Structure formats: C-alpha cells, structure tokens
Amino acid sequence: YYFGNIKFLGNTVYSDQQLNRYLGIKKGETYNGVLLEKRIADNTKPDGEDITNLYQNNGYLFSKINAVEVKTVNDTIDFEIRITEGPIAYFNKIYVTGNDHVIYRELRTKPGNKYSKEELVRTIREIGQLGFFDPESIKPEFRNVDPAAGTVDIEYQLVEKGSSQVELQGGYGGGGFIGTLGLSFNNFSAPMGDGQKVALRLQGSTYFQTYSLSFSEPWFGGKKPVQFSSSISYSKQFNYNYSSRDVNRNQSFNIFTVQVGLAKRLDDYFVLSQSVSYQHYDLNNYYTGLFTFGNGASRNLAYTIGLSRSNKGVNPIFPTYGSEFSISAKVTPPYSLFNNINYGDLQNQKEYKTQYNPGDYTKTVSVGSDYKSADTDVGKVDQKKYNWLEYYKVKFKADWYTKIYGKLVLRTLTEFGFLGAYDQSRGVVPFERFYLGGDGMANYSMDGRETIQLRGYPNNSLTPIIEDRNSSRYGQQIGATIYNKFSMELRYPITLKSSASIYALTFLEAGSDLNRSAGAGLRVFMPAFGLLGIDFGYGFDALTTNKANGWETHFIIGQQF
C-alpha cells in the first residue's frame, strides 16, 4: 500500500501550496498512519511543526483538521484533508485566581490581542520564574468562549507555595570549583507585597570568599521595567597562581564594596545600564606582581555606563539568528587635575626616601643626611599614587550569529578592551586589569579582574609577566591593559527539547599579531545539572623554544563568559 493525492479542502487562510509544504508527504511513499497523524498534530510536544499548531498559533483556535479516506485502489490510498477554520480569537478579559498588580504586570496575554499559544506559554514560563507559585500547576483555563462573537477569556489557576527561596548552586572555571549558598526573600515591600527581591548570598572558591546583601526592584516606579539594584559585599581574596593551582594563605586582600545601579530599556532592542561603586581594598602582605604597597589600602570610586543591543534567537542556549553588541565605559573622577601635587617629582622628596645613626638615610649602607641620596621607597610612592584609584576603562563586544547550511549555525565573536590613566605620571592602576587565556571565568572576583576565554591554553597563561630578569619577580603575572579577541565557532545541535539541549562545536580563536587556537567540544544543558561543556583545544603557539603548546583540555559548568 502507498499514499496518493493528498488534497486539502476548504482552507482559505493558507493556500494549498504552503500547507502541502508543511505536510511534507509525497505520492508513492509507503503508507504510515502514525507518520500522517504525527505530521497533522504532534500532540507529544507543544512546539512541534504540526498543522494544528500552525493554525492555533495565529488565533484560529476553532480550526479542526480531520482525515477521511476516500478510495483504496491499485494498492494505493487517496485522502482529502478537511479544514474547518472558524473566526479569529481575541482575548477579552484576563484574570488570575488562586493568588495582584505584580502578577498582572507580567502578563504577555493582554486584552485585545490576537490569540497566540506562544504568548500563553511565555506567560506560564514567566509566572513560574517569579517563583512564588507551584511550577507544575500554572493552568490557563478558558471561560466565556463565544465563537459567535469571536472572543475568549483566560483564567490562570495558581497555587501559592511561599515567597522565600533557598539556593545552592555550583560551577567550574579557571581550574577550580565555585559554589554559592543563597537565601532570597522575593517579596520585601516597605514583609508581603511588591516584587522587590532581597537576597543574602555567599560565594566561595579555592582562593576567594564573598558575602553579599543584594536588593533589587524589577519595576522601578511601577510603570516600566527599570531595574534598580543595590549590593553591599565583603570579599577576601588570596594570591592565586592559576597556572599551578596552588594558593598562598599569607597574601590576601579584603574588598568592601557598595554598588548602586539601574538598568532601563530605551529603537527598542537597546538596554542602558548605569552603576556607581565604592570599593575599599585592604591589602595584607600582598607583595606580588606590580604591587609594592602590600600593607596599605586603596579606595575606588567608579561610575559605569553601558549600551547593549540584543536580538538573538529564541533559545538563549542555542541561538539561530541575530546579533548582540555591548559597549561599556567605566570612569573614575579625575583627581590628578585638581590635586596640585607633582607625581614626577615625588621620588625626590624627603618624605618618600628610605630611613632607618638613627634617622639616617640608606641606599644597606648609611649615606648620611643627604636628602637627594638613598633609595626612592617604592612602597610609599606607589601608596601615594594609588590611595585613590584613577583609571578609565572601555570594553566592546560583538556576537553575530548566522545560519549557514542545514541546521548548522556559525557564531562570530569579537572583543576589544582598554584601560588607562588620566595622567601618565600617575601610572596605570594594578587593579581592574585583563587576564587572558584558559577556561574563562566571569567577574566572580570583585577586584575587576576579567578572565578571557581562549581554549587550548592553560588557565591564565598568556597574561604578561615581569621580564626584567634581575627584578627578583620574574615569572609573576602583572596583567594586560589592552586585549583583543576574535572567535569563530560552528555548532550543530542534537536535541533542542526543554529538558535537554545538546550540541557539538568546532572553534577557531585568536587572542592577544595574536596567539591562535583550534579545537572541538560538546555542550549539554539541562535545567537541573546546568550547562556542562567539554572542550579539547590544540594551540599552535607557545606560552625559549618556539614550539607549540599543543593539546589541552577544559571541563566547565555554567556560562563562563
């Protein structure tokens, strides 16, 4: 038996040709009733490319697709698919029962809008992401369905399950584990009420521990989605050698941070983000790298601005069309112009020379009381230079996705980053510097360090090192002030279900004339176990002999960008 002459009757919204293209059944193939029903209506999944959802996604909710067998001759079966459309569906009144303005503000199914199952699914997902209600019983149920007037009413059945939440999360990056414990009350008001979130969180890795209190208002003013965030945090960070994964427990600094910030949506794809941050770095025996003021303290007052454009594909895990652009500028007040002290002649002043005959100056050999002699104490000069941090920072990121051929997707990434000082005599600050190479890790550390991902190379291997030889600090990393990366990845998916999202990828990266890397990897995303990615990368360039680094492997958990 074989199919024959699938004909579509009584459909006027779509032509015969488009629906035939959507059916994908050709004459002469072997009859498969299961296949016919699956193509007609894949009831197993809500996002299937089936005809019933094709009609139901644009609002012809009363459309019914049934099959009637007309003739079976010459071992060939003929059909006439019948479509009965009905009028378009418009929402009239949308109400929620079982809980008010907090829920209503986050509804995608507004009154007067054309019916779309995608909107109902999105509202379900958003109410679930709010967290107060039981995720398994967010039930949209239809009332006052009047096909006579073409209207529909929706009631959302919900069950309360508490506002508070506890969270234990984990990840891996930089060759080290990371984990957070968080207690988050998702309703604070001015207590029960508005959607203001207040969370107490603690994050830890092998070399840094952070404690934080974070308040966040998602709808500032109650009209438009303006996020107002505030965070008071205290962190302790060790000297960590990312290459060898050992830690020194006697070289550590404490960062006390207070940040206020605001994000608002402007076109309409743009987001403008602003922040004001105060950070106090209390050092303890941190004589590592470019630091010589290991027993002092520094203060950092920063204003950060950022413009972002995002229109990526439907799945955040696996986009298939769009672009993302990000420009960020961090500025500190220019104290150099207003402070009338000279930073080039500091080394020739009596208050900055080495002292101990008691009170004499030393070059250690006593050199008398000649104030021009002795050694310019680097600790005191650097402490006076950096008691208030002075720097300007610019970051630019571009991420363009495209489809090439079939189900393949190509992702192109390009970042530039610069940091500088207003007065060149003041010098580039040792903090907020760019560290390049390895598994890559987000800004979990609050000192401004940004670990840039370049697979195929050890963690933090390409960051510049002291090259003075006789400086007694050869081999320690000091940080990069300018960095550029270009990445190009090809990705093929195996599953795009809600439960699991798996895809394989091949990557070519060039990071800094650059160092190049090539490799392949596999990523698996699940809501429970997270985003687990395994990458194997061969680097063609060296980290004395001009021999390539060769192979390396990374295993990461979480979005380590």
């Binding site: 019983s137 969180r201 438009k224 996020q227 955040p316």
Partner: protein, 52 residues
Amino acid sequence: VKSLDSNTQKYVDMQFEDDRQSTAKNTVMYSDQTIKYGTDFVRIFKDVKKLL
C-alpha cells in the same frame, strides 16, 4: 478546545530571551554571587523528592 497540558513544568523549563516588558538586566554591575546556568541543587532535591 485543545487546551494546554495538565503539567506545566516543561513550559517553565524552556528558555527564552527578554521581551519589551521584562526586567532589564544590568551588565555594568559587579557579580550577584550567582553562577548563571549552573547546577541547581535545590531543583535536584525537589526532583529526587518527586521520584519517591
């Protein structure tokens, strides 16, 4: 009328980008002490409870 499934956990699980009236994420702040798209132990505990 063909209505949605009785269980709506799958609908919550599937991911989407931001739309014109969801909260705007701040990208010029420091860390919020969360591993985005990380392992969720609370969800693991709830799933284990559901399988018993």
